[PDB]
DNA sequence: TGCATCCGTGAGTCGGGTAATAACGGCCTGTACGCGTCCGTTTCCGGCACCCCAAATGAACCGTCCCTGGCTCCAAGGTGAACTCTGGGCGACGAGTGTT
């Protein structure tokens, strides 16, 4: 009922995000971002799962968009000198301790 | 000297075939056919006098059609760097919109 992963704690009775204690606050996307991360903790995630996921399997829309949002969760969760969202090049986004 | 009295030519065109009587032995021969026998022919069994005839049994054998040897001198595989897209990553800005 309460995840963990490193510095960042997630609820999901009441969807709330905390890094390091302070409580974050995101839009309703970024936090269902934050969530599905979250849940798969280590492996890395593909822009195909996350839009075919994160988003409704029906969304046809560009995916720069997905890559707009992992940058406004780049800026208020790996501000921290510890770096947590780790891209790789044609690969995708790994959520994953350095 | 008429005169009847024959007497001699017509008259065209492209399914078959229908019969009688006393005749009877006996001899001859004649041409055709049917027998038994003998001789020219001819056709092969195996022999030479040898005719030799020959494909098969030793050479070379030399040119040549295959091996081995070394040699290049080059054009393809390996070693550079950039760049013009190619693609992703970053970021800001704006109204249609969840809500009491």
């Given at each position: 009922?309460?995840?963990?992963?490193?510095?960042?704690?997630?609820?999901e009775?009441?969807?709330?995000?905390?890094?390091?204690?302070?409580?974050?606050s995101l839009?309703p996307?970024?936090?269902?971002?934050?969530?599905?991360?979250?849940?798969?903790?280590?492996?890395?995630?593909?822009?195909?799962?996350?839009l075919?996921?994160?988003?409704?399997?029906?969304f046809?829309?560009?995916?720069?968009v997905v890559?707009?949002?992992v940058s406004?969760?780049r800026?208020?969760?790996?501000?921290?000198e510890?770096?947590?969202?780790?891209?790789?090049?044609?690969?995708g986004?790994?959520?994953?301790?350095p």
């Amino acid at each position: 009922v309460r995840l963990t992963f490193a510095d960042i704690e997630l609820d999901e009775e009441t969807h709330e995000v905390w890094k390091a204690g302070q409580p974050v606050s995101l839009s309703p996307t970024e936090f269902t971002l934050l969530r599905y991360f979250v849940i798969n903790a280590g492996t890395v995630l593909s822009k195909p799962k996350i839009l075919d996921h994160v988003w409704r399997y029906d969304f046809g829309g560009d995916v720069n968009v997905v890559e707009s949002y992992v940058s406004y969760l780049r800026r208020k969760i790996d501000t921290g000198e510890k770096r947590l969202l780790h891209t790789l090049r044609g690969v995708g986004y790994v959520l994953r301790e350095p």
